[PDB]
Amino acid sequence: YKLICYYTSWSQYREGDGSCFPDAIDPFLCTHVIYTFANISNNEIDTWEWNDVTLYDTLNTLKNRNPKLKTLLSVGGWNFGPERFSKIASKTQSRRTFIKSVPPFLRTHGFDGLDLAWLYPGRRDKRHLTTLVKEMKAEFIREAQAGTEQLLLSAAVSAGKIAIDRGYDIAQISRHLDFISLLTYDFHGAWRQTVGHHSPLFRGNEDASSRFSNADYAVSYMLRLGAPANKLVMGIPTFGRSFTLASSKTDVGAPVSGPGIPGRFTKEKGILAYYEICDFLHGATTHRFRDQQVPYATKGNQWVAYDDQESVKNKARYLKNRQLAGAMVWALDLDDFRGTFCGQNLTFPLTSAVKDVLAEA
Numbered sequence: 001y002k003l004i005c006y007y008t009s010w011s012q013y014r015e016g017d018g019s020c021f022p023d024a025i026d027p028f029l030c031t032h033v034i035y036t037f038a039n040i041s042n043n044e045i046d047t048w049e050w051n052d053v054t055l056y057d058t059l060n061t062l063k064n065r066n067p068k069l070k071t072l073l074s075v076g077g078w079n080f081g082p083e084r085f086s087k088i089a090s091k092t093q094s095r096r097t098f099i100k101s102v103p104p105f106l107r108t109h110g111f112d113g114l115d116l117a118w119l120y121p122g123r124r125d126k127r128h129l130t131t132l133v134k135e136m137k138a139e140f141i142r143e144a145q146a147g148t149e150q151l152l153l154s155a156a157v158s159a160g161k162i163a164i165d166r167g168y169d170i171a172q173i174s175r176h177l178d179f180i181s182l183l184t185y186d187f188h189g190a191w192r193q194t195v196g197h198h199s200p201l202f203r204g205n206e207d208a209s210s211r212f213s214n215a216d217y218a219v220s221y222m223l224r225l226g227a228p229a230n231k232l233v234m235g236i237p238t239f240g241r242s243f244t245l246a247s248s249k250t251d252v253g254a255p256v257s258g259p260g261i262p263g264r265f266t267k268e269k270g271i272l273a274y275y276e277i278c279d280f281l282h283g284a285t286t287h288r289f290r291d292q293q294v295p296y297a298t299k300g301n302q303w304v305a306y307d308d309q310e311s312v313k314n315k316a317r318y319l320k321n322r323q324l325a326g327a328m329v330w331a332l333d334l335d336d337f338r339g340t341f342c343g344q345n346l347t348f349p350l351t352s353a354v355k356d357v358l359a360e361a
């Protein structure tokens, strides 16, 4: 099985124990670590942070200890606007320029591949994404002739049915990609004025937003669209999402006034790192959504949907049962990478739980 793990370049800047550099990553934890994100500038791949050449080197130094570890560099993300990808992918010349720039940059920096994280392709982009993936793979095939093991090509793909339908030709891009990481953790609509879970494995009993807004639906639908199971990797979050409650109510359908207050370390309303949730749980009441198979917790006016060791184990057992290629974790810097917040003196408790289940049989 593959265990694909993202590291984000901006996590370095978090205050105190929040700060995460790539030497905090256990070299044997994941099969693949993806550094996120690269820029695109003058239609060529490029660095983003001031110190990315340094941190790329710190990541790639992990392979001294684990020579089998593979690294990838992800291009795009939400700070890069989808419109920027669109402009590059939609024209033969800019697409070629970009694609030609990729292998030398990856080689120089010690990466084993490229991950595409276009968030997200529209209706007008679908055919261009197909061309970009096909043509980038073709360039990786040519570059391999100069003697070094062929670069890997992956993509991070929406897990929302409407987004999938609008933007991706899954049957075609699956042929050329080495794996597809399914973003099975953005299932609570931005529009909703109630609490809910963003990463449920199955639908809830009572007005799920769709029958579609759950990991099981997403996996099934990618298989049905022609993604072979051995190309599909299911995403599992190490962060949770938070809400400010509008009333004393906390169970299904509880109204909310907006996102939850930011975490001390991650400083972003509506999201909390797992290590922050560990701490939040002190004094919190914990609940599970029985049919969705994922937990939430509440205290004061704050309500948090999250994933725990149990839930991520459960998701790993599911994905093996569906004979998928493995798991993807977003993100190492949001798991308890220091080991010191979650009461177990164990680094990477979520990601490690996933690993441990992938090895079972």
Ligand SMILES: *[C@@H]1O[C@H](CO)[C@@H](O)[C@H](O)[C@H]1NC(C)=O
Residues within 6 Å of the ligand: 039, 040, 041, 042, 047, 048, 049
């Ligand atoms: C990213 O590339 C754009 C396109 O050139 C550029 O304007 C911007 O300075 C670059 N962003 C960063 C964070 O380097």
